[PDB]
Amino acid sequence: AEIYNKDGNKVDLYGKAVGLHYFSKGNGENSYGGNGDMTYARLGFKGETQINSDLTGYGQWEYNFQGNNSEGADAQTGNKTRLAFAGLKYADVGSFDYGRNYGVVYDALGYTDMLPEFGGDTAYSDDFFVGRVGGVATYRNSNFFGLVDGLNFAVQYLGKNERDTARRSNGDGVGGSISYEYEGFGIVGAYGAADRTNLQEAQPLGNGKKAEQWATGLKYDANNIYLAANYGETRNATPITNKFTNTSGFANKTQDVLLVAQYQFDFGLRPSIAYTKSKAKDVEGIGDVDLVNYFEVGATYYFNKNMSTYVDYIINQIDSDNKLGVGSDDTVAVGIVYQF
Amino acid sequence: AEIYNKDGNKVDLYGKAVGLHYFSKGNGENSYGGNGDMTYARLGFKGETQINSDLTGYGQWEYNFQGNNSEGADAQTGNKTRLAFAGLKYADVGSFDYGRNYGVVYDALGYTDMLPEFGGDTAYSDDFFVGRVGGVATYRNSNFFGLVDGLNFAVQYLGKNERDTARRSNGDGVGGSISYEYEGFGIVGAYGAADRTNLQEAQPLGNGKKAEQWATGLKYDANNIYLAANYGETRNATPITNKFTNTSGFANKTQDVLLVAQYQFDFGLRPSIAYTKSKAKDVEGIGDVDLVNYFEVGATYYFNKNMSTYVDYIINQIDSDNKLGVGSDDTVAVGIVYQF
Amino acid sequence: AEIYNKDGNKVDLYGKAVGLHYFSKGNGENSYGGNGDMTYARLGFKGETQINSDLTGYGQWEYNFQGNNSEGADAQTGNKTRLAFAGLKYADVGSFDYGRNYGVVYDALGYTDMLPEFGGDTAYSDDFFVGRVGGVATYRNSNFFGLVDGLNFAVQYLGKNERDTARRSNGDGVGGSISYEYEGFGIVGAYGAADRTNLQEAQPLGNGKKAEQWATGLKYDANNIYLAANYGETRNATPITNKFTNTSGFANKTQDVLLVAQYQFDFGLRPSIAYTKSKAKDVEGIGDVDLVNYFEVGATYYFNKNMSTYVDYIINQIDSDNKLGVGSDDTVAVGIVYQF
């Protein structure tokens, strides 16, 4: 909600209260998303200032508060700053912003990440170029310097993040994306390469000094119709876990496919169907394994721009004898969303 | 303070900064409230959207930030999300919201929870139905479908919360309440029952598979006069600790009595007196023992709807040879509250 | 940014997004400020209500969110409530506020705490009277009861904080400050003394029952010119660490000197240079040793009151053979800041 607009500076204070519960069979240890309350809140601000007729400065912040914790010792469990950056936009030159913002490959992955609750399974947080990540400087250009309508591109530099855990770690990297839109159609390709930290190589699973992520996408977004497809490959880049041996790390190679089909009825209903297959190869001791594999059917009901409820049903295709101990049970989400 | 109201949606951004100090003799280890700085801040949003003439949507979030912590490792000690839910309200049919909201029995306990700082001692956080608690879907209905002015009631369903601590866990449960008000008078009855977790039974104190909490209240609230009385009973639900044996759990049976008397003077002062006695029975190894027992004297001075100060003196009736090692000393609070 | 003004209460919601990166050779520990991503965000409210034509009430809250953390287990590392207090201001009597607020000695140190990124090394967090501290009660008076323009003073009481770390602990104490300004010029003096906790004496470094901090400053702040000079001494108060022995504590005596020179060009540039030397004496086992010693050159370019960028280069004079293992390398900061 824009709550300040004066002297060439505007501040939108946005957020939401999302009441949410997951239902899966048994306890749901062996399920896709789990079982129980998943209620949460978002808060964030978008600030934008007009420095002059061509030049804009801006900054955005966003925090996820969890609401399924007690007021006890676990009060902070799952709270996080999701976004935190600042940047400039100048004429038809382009924009540059630095901080913790989504990685360049998500430019593609965003295409299919449209589901009521789930989906976009391959957009892991702090996972190099496929998701939200600290320490990125990104340059973007719209309509190619004002000469080509619909031609966007971006080059991203990834700063080194040597953390205590291997999962949230990354080396220095470079990435990019190119996208074209014309009359409802959209095509995007994105690729990133990065150094791996020593701490990541010292891990049981995954082998290489270089992580590589690339993805392409197609979409049709018009007349209440949304269709989307993502295909991607990763080299030493998808985080994975062996549930039997209790070891952690990355998959040597993965192939990811996402399909999304949604229709927006005028009366409030937006039924959604989807398909996801993320498969790994060369997982040490295990080899080839499916990390993600499901059909999804769901629907969001929009009361208006501020209120919605949805049901998101994940039909698991993963087999109970999954070599990586991946959950095989189905999971259902029921959400009611106030936002501003 | 309502800081956005446009296109049929309003957002009230409220919070407070409460400078607060506790005074007990010595270390205040052996007292009711403790000794030292207790400064805190609250921040939150109450959002409401008008969907159509009968149907309103809403969502609320609320956070407690502690200010008596350093900027070191304990910076987070006592910060927590208090409220986080979303819901719908339809005509004279009623309202429904899901998430973290006050438990149903609070509808009774709210009558006596009116003190400047302390009081309402039997409304423990994460204690099934008497205080703020995770995972509740609540139906409330005012004036009985619009057919009976003043007759409100509510039914609450409590989701299972298997946490790391027994204190902060709860099983599956259901509760309900009925209140009637007429020309200053108010009467309320409330009752809830719920399953207990394994981790809760594996505690030294308390025996049963079922938690039960009920409370009733009478009150007169008119012409600057506030009177309130609560009586309630609990079975295997009230959290307790043995300070000697260092053992934890719930009391098998408790009886709670709270009286509150306040008058609001027009020149700003609101002197308050209260009495609280919460005693337990069938406490393993001890039997009958008083958990809470004090008379309270205090006064709050309102500068305005945004500024106040108070002094709250707790005269403890608990004896120093309390079988559960409960504090016997008095505690005084000095508060200055800015709010919006 | 003022976002509410109705019925005699105003609420300014302020905060920022600071994209920031640190540059030092190698990993970062043997440097001044470190190496890698340091993006952070602030959020806060300043509230003020008019009770009547003479009496004003106010409250402020301010929080730091870190953005250089992952979304894993380290999500909260470096987040903190910086400010949390409430107070009153009455006519020409003066103002009084309680909570977690800046120490009184900061009234002096503020003259020099003006660099684009670093500087103000003697404004330690939770360090009695030289930095932000919980449980302080301050009375302040401007223009000496309104009779003498430019003559301001403050008296501050520091409440006891028996915490887990000697670094973040403090006993009961008293402090004060007096400042006078005339036609661009300013002079300020401040002094505070306090009891030390048992846990603080039980530390290896530092000897005494009374901690003492005092500091004076001169400044000229007019016609785009900013100059500042600060000199101070501490007794058993500056937190210090032996990097070789992994021992922590306080320096028995410190002498601190700070110089700051800045000029604000009308076209947007504000170059800043500084000098800071904080050296300790009678440090157990070592004796005399330098804690802080550098020359600084940097510049902030202001796009407007909402957007700015800076480069701040620290030239460390600290020796690689520092007896306390204090980093000896230089550090460069690069920042881009949106604020409101």
From Swiss-Prot, chains A, B, C:
Q: Which UniProt keywords apply?
A: Cell outer membrane, Ion transport, Membrane, Porin, Protein transport, Signal, Transmembrane, Transmembrane beta strand, Transport
Membrane topology, Extracellular segments: 24-38, 67-82, 101-134, 160-171, 196-210, 236-252, 282-291, 316-330
Q: Where are the transmembrane segments?
A: 1-6, 8-23, 39-51, 54-66, 83-91, 94-100, 135-141, 150-159, 172-182, 184-195, 211-222, 224-235, 253-265, 268-281, 292-303, 306-315, 331-340
Which SUPFAM superfamilies did the record assign?
Porins
Bilayer topology: Multi-pass membrane protein
Q: Which CDD domains match?
A: gram_neg_porins
Which cellular components does GO assign to this protein?
cell outer membrane; membrane; monoatomic ion channel complex; pore complex
Q: What happens when the gene is disrupted?
A: Leads to decreased susceptibility to a number of hydrophilic antibiotics including ampicillin, cefoxitin and tetracycline. Deletion of ompF confers resistance to colicin E5.
Q: Which InterPro entries match?
A: Gram-neg_bact_OMP (IPR050298), Gram_neg_porin_domain (IPR033900), Porin_dom_sf (IPR023614), Porin_gammaproteobac (IPR001897), Porin_Gram-ve (IPR001702), Porin_Gram-ve_CS (IPR013793)
Q: Which named protein is this?
A: Outer membrane porin F
Q: Which gene produces this protein?
A: ompF
Q: What induces it?
A: By growth in low osmolarity conditions (low sugar or salt); activated at low osmolarity by OmpR, repressed at high osmolarity by OmpR (at protein level). Levels of OmpF protein decrease in a lon/ycgE double disruption (at protein level).
* Positions on the Periplasmic side per record topology: 7, 52-53, 92-93, 142-149, 183, 223, 266-267, 304-305
Q: Print the domain comment field.
A: Each subunit of the trimer has a water-filled pore with a narrow, elliptically shaped (7 X 11 Angstroms) selectivity filter which has a solvent accessible area of 30-40 Angstroms(2).
Instruction: Name the Pfam families for this protein.
Output: Porin_1
The family annotation for this protein states: Belongs to the Gram-negative porin family.
Location relative to the cell: Cell outer membrane
Is Repressor one of the keywords?
A: no
Biological process (GO) annotations held by this record are: monoatomic ion transmembrane transport; protein homotrimerization; protein transport
Under NCBIfam families, the record lists:
PRK10002.1
Protein function: Forms pores that allow passive diffusion of small molecules across the outer membrane. (Microbial infection) It is also a receptor for the bacteriophage T2. Is the major receptor for colicin E5.
Describe the protein's quaternary organization and the partners it interacts with.
Homotrimer. Forms mixed heterotrimers with OmpC and with PhoE; other mixed heterotrimers are also probable.
Which one of the record's GO molecular function terms can you name?
monoatomic ion channel activity
